[PDB]
Amino acid sequence: XXAXGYX
Fold this sequence. Notes:
By secondary structure, the chain is mostly loops.
């Protein structure tokens, strides 16, 4: 992924 979250 490389981005994050959380949704």
